Symmetry: D2
Subunit: 387 residues, 4 copies
């Protein structure tokens, strides 16, 4: 009876009731993850012909953004779940990903991340009949309480080629440490894992066409980048709305102010006008990138490298704006909420901390470098796991 | 048979050949205004049933933006000509503006500005069957070399009531001074005017419904605001493109740089990335406001105050971004063009000077106040001649 | 025999060993406060004739800054202790403050804050030979584990008159709640207090000359402002130094960088150059204000309103720079320390959180208003408890 | 009867009367240069034992700053005159520079610049008995109407070594084109020169100890950098004062303002407070660098490389602040002077144009790179002609 957005907004309201306490507690948000299981939204990105809801990417990412207004850790593991599904869809054969889609939709499997291209400590050995992953990995966003994992390993042949597999999260030999302890994103379980001779079947390797191959396959890093981008916008929007409520409900006018109510103070209003101009610009850039992703995805394997590159530029443009202007809102909102809004029971700084943490994993200065290469030299970005 | 955009682009390419020397001379760009007369573009906004081209406002404003890339003074008088046509369309009866539209399209009349709501030095006396305007006016953008003028006067009853008329620019008693000397917009003829017992017939007064009446008539200041906004964007786009050509052609690498070519300098590329993110955000905000103007214009007299207010907010948001981020591009581009690009024969500072002058006639701080009133309090802007 | 600066540096090195874990715990830093008692530094500002060290204000504030590099909560309660001593020195008769000074230096009394001019929930009744304070107070910075308190109350005559007293912290009727829970300054004990018929002798009231009387007595809010300002600078300096160590020890180069070492990355170096320019400007502004405070203090009761006003302007100028540029360093340092520096065991965000909390108790926008009144109109600031 | 500063301020008042008209005219300010000749200030930096006034560098640069408030072109050629005297003082033998100092003080010789290390088009040939400079040069600041020139040439031996000479400006073979045509600094005569077999005696070569030799000799580029820096501060201070006068005299309050007078408008006052904080920070950084230059100069040939390096860092820090914050004041002052202040008769943009032009000859991004190398790595700057 409800649309996916309506279902997400209802869930977000329930999440908001415990979000502040859970930011302090950290750990696995098991009750919230089960609420996602029961909602149906783990099948949001899966087409209806496999039992899913058939949303376009722009709708899936809209739900990521909606969760991020209240709970960016939940938004992160939810968005990464659909990124893992995109990974098998783009990197493997229909005989592999179609059953995975059907089982995920039927059983509400939660997919977690164990793919770190910049962590070559996990290696794969070939034992003829099967292969085995062995080593350690970090930044395993949402591996705990998951049913399936996307795991990477290096095959030390001619310098070391990355190999990606989809495997059950409880398979023998996998030890998920859940030592994730960070100032932000405190419920994404982005801790460590140990792989001890973990068996991987040929049928579980994502090889055809595999990573960084066709332009369509090369949408995978762009989906990841735009997932983060929607999170960034959601965090800024949630911070803004929380500040609004506080300004109107609790903030007292400064005794030197010319007005009697905070909501008429000329400096307070100018701050809110600057927040508005920033948010409006981010919103249009993010939504334009999402529409371009919809259009690129619809071309499938016929996607051109040119169209992929223009999408990549549009996403990076949105990400820079969401990162920089978003973090500024999360800091400067304290000037309109005031000295009492720093009470630890409110944890109003959680928006800033979450966004500060997540904007560092892909350095902004090198995003500007890439965008300048387009703006000055008309050079398309080179497809990587970050671009 | 070229489209209006193609026609405007061809003219802009010709204007570009002399724009630098004309920035120096100032005065009236009579040759360029005659090129506009010959082009048909003075009828761009006039519906086809009166002999015009039938463009939507977004298309008319796109031409303003295109002209502003190469010559913001021409962009200004061209945009203001269409604003004058909008003024008679919105404030007077069809018995008045339909003949004016037909004559303008048939004879390529150029319409000029003599409407300043601030300056109240012009007063209107009633002589029975006719009236007379007498006084001084400033900022008469495009009055020189025009066929028709929109002129305002104050009637001295009940503290003053503003009266607006459309009258031929050469009518007895009108003196245009051509004493316009400004650091920017140096070919807009925005000088001074003197009216001495200028006869004004009742059929020339714009009374039904007159200014600041219906939401539809209250589109007039919004068209003005969005005309300036398209000019601001065009100036920044033209400055950006001129900087690109200089960086790639003339600028030398700094002897402390690690790279052989300025094309690859990490700081140069980062600047161009920041210019790109700024321009892309402005572009989407301006084009969104343009689309909302098309949709509101289509409502005609059925337009609601609520839709007018949301359009107003969208335009002001775009105007703030275009003003602030546009001026920043026009200043900071010198860091990527280098010490030789300040040669007086290039007049590369003309973009900054033009934007610096035009961003002052409506103070940004009070636009942010208005936007904060919306963002914080959900208060729609109050219709005025600037909002 | 060490100098006070050397003694403070030694203590700061010891405080640094546990500052991160104490930021987590919160509560009262009893061990560190006892280390202050043993150090002699609680008598730093007390003249030698009373058994103190005889420091100038610039020297006392230098120690506040030194502590703030490693532990801004300790810096806060230490600076506020000396502010309390300044309060009795400036507002009461030598018959009152000379014994308090002698006893403080002999017994290493820690003085705490219970003076909030905003909060008027505490009232004083006159019972003839004595008075009684009853009510609630908030923001009681350093009241816990103190020997003496500076407490204010309102007398309900002629719309309210503020009364200030110095009283022992354990006097019957005083309850300190230790309910202080804030995102920053987590060991300043700035919780709540309750007074119930707290007896106050006439000899404990600070009436002659009392607050906001002579220009010399009006140094009290300026000492408070410059104490915060030295804390703001110290926080930014400590954050900068902690970032340096991380950049050089732990941060890895981005795989798109041209350089092998983060030490040589052009964007990293540019960030550190911008941090340097900011810190150097703040440092000179703060030290100039400190020198002007020494010179004004030396005038004693002969201080003129004009010299007080110029000092006020100098302090506010330093405070704006330290607040704004300091918070920027504390945020932007994460771009040069990288994605691994957000580990919760490092609490590298503690500098930003501490500065973000403390910069709100006196709104920056109205400090800029005051400074513009000087810069434009040559109007001296009006003495208040914040200016 | 007047001190040099008083004499300069009196001259500055006379210069201010024609400054706006001369910014338009360009060319050589011959009347103003003769006024400098008659003032005695061309001997300001020459010790009294040679007939000069014996000012310290901080006083000479204070006069540069004072001229720059009203006329940055005059400030530039005046400052470069004393830089040329410093060049012979630091690079040549007492038997060379002592007579040059005596003759300059006795005859008020004006020294001009023809030294461009980045213009290797002028070469020197050795004819045994004498040498000859031949080729072209650009950026010859103030060579016109000068008595002496500092000229450079490359000796094409082992790659090309730079050779510096002091020679009469009217010597046979020198053709000063005076084609200087720039958007700012329009009266510095920084045009071109042609050298046609210009004879140079051994006694005119600056060889012992020559350029970039001892730390003391290496003060020459630092004097140049700090001369520009004092100019930058002076320009910002003059722009600020001119804006003040306009705000208080001519600016009208915006019709949406809450106040009746511009000087009480809260946004206007906040702008002026930001100008104040910026100017105060620049002032202290510039004055601190000037004091350090005084102290370094006084050490003479005993100056250590360490003390030179710390001076270089202090100057670069001041220059970055003066450049960036100065240019921001020159742009943002238009928001408090308003729409009528762009009148071309006022040329209020001349401050921005002058500072925009002069901040480009040493790129700010690479200054930040150098300062970061100090801040992060504690690496002293490497002496060059720009550092």
């Amino acid at each position: 009876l409800l649309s996916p957005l309506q279902t997400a907004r209802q869930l977000a309201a329930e999440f908001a009731l415990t979000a502040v306490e859970r930011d302090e507690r950290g750990g696995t948000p098991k009750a919230e993850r089960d609420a996602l299981r029961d909602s149906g939204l783990l099948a949001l990105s899966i087409p209806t012909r496999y039992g899913g809801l058939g949303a376009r990417w722009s709708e899936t990412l809209q739900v990521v953004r909606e969760f991020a207004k209240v709970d960016s850790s939940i938004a992160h593991v939810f968005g990464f779940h659909h990124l893992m599904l995109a990974t098998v869809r783009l990197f493997s054969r229909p005989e592999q990903w179609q059953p995975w889609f059907e089982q995920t939709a039927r059983q509400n499997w939660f997919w977690g991340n164990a793919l770190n291209p910049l962590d070559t400590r996990t290696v794969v050995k070939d034992l003829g009949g099967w292969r085995e992953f062995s080593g350690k990995k970090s930044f395993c966003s949402g591996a705990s309480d998951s049913q399936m994992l996307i795991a990477s390993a290096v095959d030390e042949s001619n310098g070391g080629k990355l190999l990606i597999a989809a495997i059950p999260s409880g398979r023998s030999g996998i030890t998920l440490h859940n030592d994730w302890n960070n100032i932000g994103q405190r419920q994404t379980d982005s801790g460590s894992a140990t792989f001890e001779r973990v068996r991987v079947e040929e049928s579980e390797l994502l090889l055809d066409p595999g990573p960084l191959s066709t332009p369509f396959a090369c949408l995978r890093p762009l989906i990841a980048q735009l997932t983060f981008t929607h999170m960034f916008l959601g965090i800024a929007e949630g911070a803004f709305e929380e500040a609004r409520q506080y300004t109107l409900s609790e903030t007292r006018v400064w005794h030197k102010s010319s007005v009697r109510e905070v909501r008429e103070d000329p400096y307070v209003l100018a701050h809110y006008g600057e927040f508005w101009v920033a948010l409006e610009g981010i919103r249009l850039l993010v939504e334009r990138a999402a529409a371009l992703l919809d259009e690129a995805w619809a071309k499938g394997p016929n996607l051109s490298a040119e169209e992929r590159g223009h999408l990549a530029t549009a996403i990076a443009t949105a990400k820079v704006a969401a990162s920089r202007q978003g973090l500024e809102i999360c800091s400067r909102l304290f000037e309109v909420t005031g000295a009492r809004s720093t009470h630890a029971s409110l944890r109003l700084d959680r928006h800033w901390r979450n966004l500060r943490t997540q904007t560092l994993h892909d350095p902004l200065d090198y995003k500007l470098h890439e965008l300048g290469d387009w703006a000055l030299n008309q050079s398309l970005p080179v497809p990587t796991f970050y671009s």
